[PDB]
Design a protein around this ligand. Sequence first.
Ligand SMILES: COc1ccc(/C=N/NC(=S)N[C@@H]2O[C@H](CO)[C@@H](O)[C@H](O)[C@H]2O)cc1
Ligand SMILES: COc1ccc(/C=N/NC(=S)N[C@@H]2O[C@H](CO)[C@@H](O)[C@H](O)[C@H]2O)cc1
Ligand SMILES: COc1ccc(/C=N/NC(=S)N[C@@H]2O[C@H](CO)[C@@H](O)[C@H](O)[C@H]2O)cc1
Ligand SMILES: COc1ccc(/C=N/NC(=S)N[C@@H]2O[C@H](CO)[C@@H](O)[C@H](O)[C@H]2O)cc1
Lengths: 811, 811
Amino acid sequence: QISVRGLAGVENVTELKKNFNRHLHFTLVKDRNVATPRDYYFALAHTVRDHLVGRWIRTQQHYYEKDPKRIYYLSLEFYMGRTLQNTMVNLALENACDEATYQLGLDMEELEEIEEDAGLGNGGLGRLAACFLDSMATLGLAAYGYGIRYEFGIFNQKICGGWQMEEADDWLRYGNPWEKARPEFTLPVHFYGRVEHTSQGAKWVDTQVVLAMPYDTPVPGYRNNVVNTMRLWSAKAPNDFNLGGYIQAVLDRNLAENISRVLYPNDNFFEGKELRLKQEYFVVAATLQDIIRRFKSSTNFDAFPDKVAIQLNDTHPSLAIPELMRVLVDLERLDWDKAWEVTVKTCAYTNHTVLPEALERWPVHLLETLLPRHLQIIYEINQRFLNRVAAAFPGDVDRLRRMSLVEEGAVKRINMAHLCIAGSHAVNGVARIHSEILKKTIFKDFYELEPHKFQNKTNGITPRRWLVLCNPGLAEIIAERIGEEYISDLDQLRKLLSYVDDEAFIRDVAKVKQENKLKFAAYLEREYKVHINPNSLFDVQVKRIHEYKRQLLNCLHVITLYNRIKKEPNKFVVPRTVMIGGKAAPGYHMAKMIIKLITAIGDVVNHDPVVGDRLRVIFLENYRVSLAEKVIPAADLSEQISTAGTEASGTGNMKFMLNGALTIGTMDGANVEMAEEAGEENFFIFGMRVEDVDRLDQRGYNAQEYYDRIPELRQIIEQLSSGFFSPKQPDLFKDIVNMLMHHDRFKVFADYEEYVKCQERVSALYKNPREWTRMVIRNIATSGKFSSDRTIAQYAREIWGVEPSRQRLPA
Amino acid sequence: QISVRGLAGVENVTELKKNFNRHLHFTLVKDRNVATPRDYYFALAHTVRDHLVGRWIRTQQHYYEKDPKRIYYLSLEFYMGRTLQNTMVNLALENACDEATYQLGLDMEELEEIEEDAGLGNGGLGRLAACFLDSMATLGLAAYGYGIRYEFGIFNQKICGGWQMEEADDWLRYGNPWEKARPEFTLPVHFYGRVEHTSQGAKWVDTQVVLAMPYDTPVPGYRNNVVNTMRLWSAKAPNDFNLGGYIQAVLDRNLAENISRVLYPNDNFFEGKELRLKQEYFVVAATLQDIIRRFKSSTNFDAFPDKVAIQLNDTHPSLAIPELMRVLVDLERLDWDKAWEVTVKTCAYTNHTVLPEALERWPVHLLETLLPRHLQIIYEINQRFLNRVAAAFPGDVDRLRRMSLVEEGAVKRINMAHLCIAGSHAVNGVARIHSEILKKTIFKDFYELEPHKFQNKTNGITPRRWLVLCNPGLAEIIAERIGEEYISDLDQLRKLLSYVDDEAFIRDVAKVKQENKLKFAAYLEREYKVHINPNSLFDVQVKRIHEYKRQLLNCLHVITLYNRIKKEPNKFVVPRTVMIGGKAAPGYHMAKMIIKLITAIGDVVNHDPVVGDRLRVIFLENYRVSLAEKVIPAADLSEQISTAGTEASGTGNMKFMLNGALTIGTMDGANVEMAEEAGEENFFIFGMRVEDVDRLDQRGYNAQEYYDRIPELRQIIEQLSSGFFSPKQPDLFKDIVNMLMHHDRFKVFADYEEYVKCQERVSALYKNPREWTRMVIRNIATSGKFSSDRTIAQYAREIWGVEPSRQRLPA
Ligand SMILES: COc1ccc(/C=N/NC(=S)N[C@@H]2O[C@H](CO)[C@@H](O)[C@H](O)[C@H]2O)cc1
Ligand SMILES: COc1ccc(/C=N/NC(=S)N[C@@H]2O[C@H](CO)[C@@H](O)[C@H](O)[C@H]2O)cc1
Ligand SMILES: COc1ccc(/C=N/NC(=S)N[C@@H]2O[C@H](CO)[C@@H](O)[C@H](O)[C@H]2O)cc1
Ligand SMILES: COc1ccc(/C=N/NC(=S)N[C@@H]2O[C@H](CO)[C@@H](O)[C@H](O)[C@H]2O)cc1
């Protein structure tokens, strides 16, 4: 049907049809009389995956023969979403499969909806890993993603009586066609035990063993025939484990296997839970053995950093540093100084937040019991590091305690971020402002000691998933004017600037958005029985629920609009559909209250006859990658409204920009760079800058001052307090009011006035569809910088020391 | 190479080779450079299983169109062993696959050794289920085996310092190519809760739910294109199960899923363990819903018994009786009397033991908590049943308490055997003598009330696995003379009687045995580094370790032989290799002591220079189906030496008879019928008959009497007591001596003299190879009755009311 989806040739269509029928029969053991829609999905998935196999084998064979430097991306999260459409896109098979299935009497889009998301992440950090894997494959890098195969990913969110309920994400229930178990590469991982010091160095003995079994998932590059590997480890008990008493011993195998059972969803507050520590070591120990094995199958560890790069995605896999030291010193018998040099040159660390409560600070007593040898290595690293600090800054005793890897206090803790900086040759933030904040504030001491280590690598998103896949209509009208090359060279979108006055293009851009909005309005009614006005402005805020992200500020605006309508009912206002979605971490009470507030506002607003279809508030249940692919193309206004200095980058922001929504946002994270690329005139910027926040903190933030001077704000607080939004439980939102009034770390009131005024300017522009669309074109045209291909090319050149390549492998 | 293995045609060989290469590539993601032997096994398994699919779909389609009466064989055990060779045999693909793999540069026998046994059973009862499935498919019956998919089957046995150690049988570790998950037929199973009595009858409410997910395994008939199904249930938690606290709730899902985790190995002593009760209900509840669903997809439950037979394999699935009543009365709203009539006509029960400690007697308090509605139904069944007894035998109050389903005492218990008799239209024992013992002793009261219910169905074994597969050399020399028809009509082996004087045949039979012995002697040295004399008499006792099976009596003979050699070292004796193997239930202390005794005897005997190669004692580690397939063809003498009246049938006995070993045995179980078929002159019968045992019990068994009057026996006991077989732990075997002397339920001493004398007659015959072989021929020629095809034809005609068919389905 559409060009960017590839050719539907006679030979390929015929072959796809026959292979589909083969899989239905031999693989699924069904015929057409008894086959369920799920059977049809699986037959298609097997048919498509068959096309990856040869490319996968020859890519890995190529890496073996050429022996390039390998890149190992270590993450506890890979938020992959669905794989079927993405594989078709990268193989240029979409139109062929669409045709093939159509001729078989099936709707391929319906089949695509059957696939479970691989929800092996929480949000931004996990999705970044996934975009990065796509870009590394597209850029021809010899890259491997290494993580954990969680049996249960991020919970499915149900809303019951306006409240979040969590249910297990049993994503493997029906089997996963995208993985290949590799039990031949099973590796032992050690826990507990004790350290013996012999004449021949230290030895870690009397350990408990858990097996790490790898599962390989292909990562196809965009039409370059490259297929990289994501290897995820699963925990398995050894067969003599714990071996009535016999029955119990077999049942107890579960304890070992619990390591890979479930993804921790607490992205708000570091919890020093032993199981989480075990997960972190498990991935690191298995991965490092695999890396070392591959390196030896090329004695001379001097060449190790020439052949190996390890990227630590936050501090979660920070134990790689002392683990690499452990293997090099205890097992390979390298001297300390040489092992350290190798380690530093091998490892690099990416920081993803500045919020203190998210920083990993592991109790020493936990490490002492679980990983006794690693603790000793960490102490030794600390001593040698602090000796360097003392030599560089003689007599600066407070610097010594500030920089120590060991934090003294009630319970002694290890600061894993300090470990990561000490043991890495490169440390990067994820947007220019975030990287500057790292140098100026939280890692200032480290920057002063080793300024060469600190870099910026502004985040990006893959334009394959986040344009071609989710928004084929937009991809097509762009390709009609400028060709297909931009899909792997997103900077080419700049060429669209010469179409900003083009009447045909203006019309096409606006038409594609309208279609997307119609499609999404239909999705809502079908799957959720909720009815919306497709001519309204689609105002969307989707991302995890956090106080810093200020879904609450959005709520205040919504109530402001409702109150203004109720005050002057017969005045014209631009109709809006306000959509808010995202999961709250299960133990984060305030985030759970915020969800309940949003639904409670919806309950009042959506049933007020005077409002009509002029304002609708919808909570988007179970926000996840597959839902983002639907709502993002449909959005007009992207809400990116974190308090300046709190959102390290954001990546949702980039997705909306690429898909033709305008942005209302603070100068925070990557928003700054987005406004810089597009021009401030083409962005709806409001609110305190980082400097204004700092000024307010020095003086002291007094919320009462705002409450006292802003009558519209006072009214909303009175409504919340008195039970206007909770008639039967008048005090339901007392926690929210109290927080806003007395302990708001994120200064919701301070940005309220500017935000509301900025929103008025949004409504003004939307009244003029032609000027709205021209500004949209200026956003899409300047979104090129935010391709993860650019991001990965920078990591490659500036951190890993490898050159990317757009050259095809032979097919 | 050999004819009974089928044709190796050019077209088939070429196609097998290409499909093997296809699977290696697309299914296993390997090429020949990196492929492991396990990869080659899997490629072959996938290649073979492809040939089953069409036949499987059309068999099940055939059953749907013809709607024959369906047979449901309910068992907690299916001891299947390996599937690859068996599938090739039944599809006539063996020679073709051998050729195909040979041309690919692979040894197929080596590939076959890679497959794990499906060890989903303990011994005889589990293996019987497996032989029955093979025969039902071969006889064209619309039969389904229903059981549990244990994650862990019977433990692997390791011998460490002469002691049994158990390790988990993680048989699914590498995946199972012989199953297809069927998550679309997932069913809820209910536990706990309480009963409410409404106006509209009883209701079972507030239950906990566990999901039952089925996995289907094909059961191919012998060259008739029939492929039946074995459906095994796996336990899955529902997604809202139990839904920090979030993490724990996900981890707790294990509790629900533990139901199908492990096979109970305690075949010696009934343990009223709650988990075992849950397993029993789980299989019954899921199976009955599946049966009812299939029946409705044909209101009128009068036709239910015309379309459904349920065979209960022992009492383990006895809850089918009250479960069927529950569904019929509570859910379908049938009146009690009609529901009962349907139930009785549907269910039949097979008893497999008379040992009182093996009988299931569930504590009432367990059923009350776990299955409150079933307890009430059981009480009601009991009341109505006892009302019938009281009417038939007025005033016989002791009969009432003897026959009650409820046993009064310390803890009230339900006698599940009594439940099974009451609720079944047929009750059968498994050999003629066992069935007679049931009528005369343990179920005498029930027989008097309902004599028409009691039947015999003598056990059998499948001649596919137990001749063609394991002993192709023997199958071939038989086929050379009498054709191939005997493989599915084993009575045809009678034709071999006319070859008992045939010099060529005598030579061939003896040659095949010698080859088998050479092959097994080689297997031992390669896999276990143990060295044996292949010219010795192979004296084998393999079966689970139990006091009633009297491995101890065999031990006494072994020591007798050793002592006689030591007394007259320069006298000629027929060399023997005595092999004993079998697993002991983990909590069965005496059985564990017996294993240690056997190894301890081996330790003395095998290293005595005076003995030489004249006597060797070997403990066969990890006896299982795949090992039986190796040792049985190699055996000369089959030890079947249970105390008369204790072995219900035995089936190992039949395997040895079919494979050219002579039998030394008591007149117990099927041994009686074997001797009757072959002629007593062609069997080595010794020892007390059942009547002699009864006579001894009335008088009182005094072991001391034997010790006092038999000097050779006294010497052995003195040796055991003094520490001759345990120098460093002189009292190691004190438990064994004490048991033999003071509390031997199985009268080991009473059969000692006759056994030793009988063994002398065995040695005498073996000195004359020509006469040994002629007697062997007379055994093989009369083994026909013991085909499970005969057994199943009798169940079909006399219990299920269906006619078997040898007619091919079209291919
Ligand atoms: C290119 O992409 C792929 C990925 C996998 C394969 C081959 N895969 N081949 C097997 S046998 N895959 C198995 O499938 C099962 C699902 O039924 C999983 O449960 C199991 O973990 C997986 O190892 C082939 C190509
Ligand atoms: C215990 O379980 C967890 C789970 C998650 C976390 C931390 N999760 N951390 C995230 S999701 N960090 C995000 O990273 C994105 C990519 O750079 C940025 O765009 C974004 O600004 C930043 O907030 C911490 C602990
Ligand atoms: C005739 O005999 C058969 C049996 C099965 C099939 C098809 N089977 N097709 C699938 S996808 N089998 C899966 O394979 C996995 C092993 O990798 C198992 O873990 C899983 O339980 C099983 O459902 C086809 C024919
Ligand atoms: C708790 O776990 C268990 C496991 C097994 C059992 C009982 N297991 N019962 C057996 S294996 N019974 C055997 O049946 C064979 C077939 O008819 C007969 O040939 C044989 O004589 C008889 O002993 C009981 C409880």
